Curated annotation (Swiss-Prot), chains A, B:
Taxonomic source organism: Vaccinia virus (strain Western Reserve) (VACV)
InterPro entries hit by this protein: Poxin_vir
Domain commentary: The substrate binding site is formed by the N-terminus of a monomer and the C-terminus of the opposite monomer.
Claim: Nucleus is one of the keywords in the record: no
Keywords of this entry: Early protein, Hydrolase, Nuclease
Name of this chain's protein: Poxin
Name of the gene: OPG188
Signal peptide extent: none
Family: Belongs to the poxin family.
Recorded catalytic activity of this chain's protein: 2',3'-cGAMP + H2O = Gp(2'-5')Ap(3') + H(+)
Length: 195, 195
């Protein structure tokens, strides 16, 4: 039966289907393996070694992941089918950053959250900056901040912070005092979508 | 002057130094770029496309990461220097899995936690299994469990679970009801150390 893809931005989230950033689908395509994709008889190259951090928030559920992206100067519409080089539909158009479009599916490093009670914020990580909790700065400032917060007892997580940089991505969680409760690091460079 | 490396297992953790699994160091070596290392003038090959999830727990702080590993049939002792091909020390022996040794430093995807109040548990992710919260099972069972828990309101995180598989690694966090509050996925296969 035909593979279906529903755009979350058009109210298409379905908990029974596979969940990717901006997409609920009846199939689960591993989109890491594609170097070329097709949209309406036009071929586009997947960018090597830089990705797009994409996320949707549907039904108090956060669905984020590092996705492959391809360069296309033409305007493509949300929901347009994306094909492989054998005519199979593998995704739909979702997110964009200037002339780059995300290829959503089973992609790279991902973050899923239950959004009730916590907040989430997205930042561009400036090159050369280190990250602690809800702040980013030069290494020495961050190191001194971390040592200061070492005296405090950890409280419950209230906010998550996503840091998207040219060489690395990170996700931190803080309590009400700004103490870093958790840090994950994704060793890839990426960009954020532009609405 | 001279790069220093201190083994956490020998009480060497220092908050003022760079922190990696099992190591506090005065330098931060990016160990992703090495394909061969030297220990006692003998060369060993870094394993392609499979890694070791290593962690130490020091001063109520969890320091884990996916690290490169190399195959060595000889016995190497914790703290023994690891060199590159040019004779420079880049790391020390830390963790082992039979004939594989971790190369600790700035590695691949990482997880840092504040251990006060929450617990952390490590699991081998069986091939073909999906993960929800504190359980791993076939896809249909996991989807059905997730939908059941979708009705519950999320509570505070009390436990983290690390899932190390042959093709993927995941970290989830659960509340007291077993509801999944958070999921990160690392798109790499790995093994756990054997004590
Ligand atoms: N979406 C997604 N992104 C990835 O980057 C990725 N990498 C691997 N996999 C695995 O592919 C198999 C299915 O193709 C699954 O074994 C999946 O393993 P898993 O990643 O271990 O998660 C178990 C399911 O459980 C899902 N859930 C998690 N929370 C919920 C929820 N509240 N309601 C409904 N479903 C939930 C979770 O999304 C998931 O199911 P879906 O594929 O249908 O999305 C991925 N899946
Ligand atoms: N350890 C480590 N593992 C990696 O896989 C990695 N990938 C990149 N980097 C960056 O390298 C620069 C320094 O080499 C830093 O900019 C760092 O970016 P960042 O990872 O953004 O910075 C947060 C700093 O701050 C550190 N802290 C975090 N919590 C504490 C604490 N309680 N006490 C003391 N320090 C703490 C945290 O470990 C850290 O500093 P350290 O290197 O000294 O470990 C890594 N660092």
């Amino acid at each position: 039966s035909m593979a279906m893809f529903y755009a979350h931005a058009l109210g298409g989230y379905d908990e029974n289907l596979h969940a990717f950033p901006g997409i609920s689908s009846t199939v689960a395509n591993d989109v890491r393996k594609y170097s070329v994709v097709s949209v309406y008889n036009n071929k586009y190259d997947i960018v090597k070694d830089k990705y797009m951090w994409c996320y949707s928030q549907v039904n108090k559920r956060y669905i984020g992941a590092l996705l492959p992206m391809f360069e296309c100067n033409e305007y493509l519409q949300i929901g347009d089918p994306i094909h492989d080089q054998e005519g199979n539909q593998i995704s739909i158009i979702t997110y964009r950053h200037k002339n780059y479009y995300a290829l959503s599916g089973i992609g790279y490093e991902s973050l899923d959250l239950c959004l009730e009670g916590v907040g989430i914020h997205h930042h561009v990580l400036e090159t050369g900056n280190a990250v602690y909790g809800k702040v980013q700065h030069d290494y020495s400032t961050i190191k001194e901040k971390a040592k200061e917060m070492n005296a405090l007892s950890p409280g419950p997580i209230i906010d998550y912070h996503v840091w998207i940089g040219d060489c690395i991505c990170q996700v931190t969680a803080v309590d009400v005092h700004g103490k870093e409760i958790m840090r994950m690091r994704f060793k890839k460079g990426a960009v954020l979508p532009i609405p």
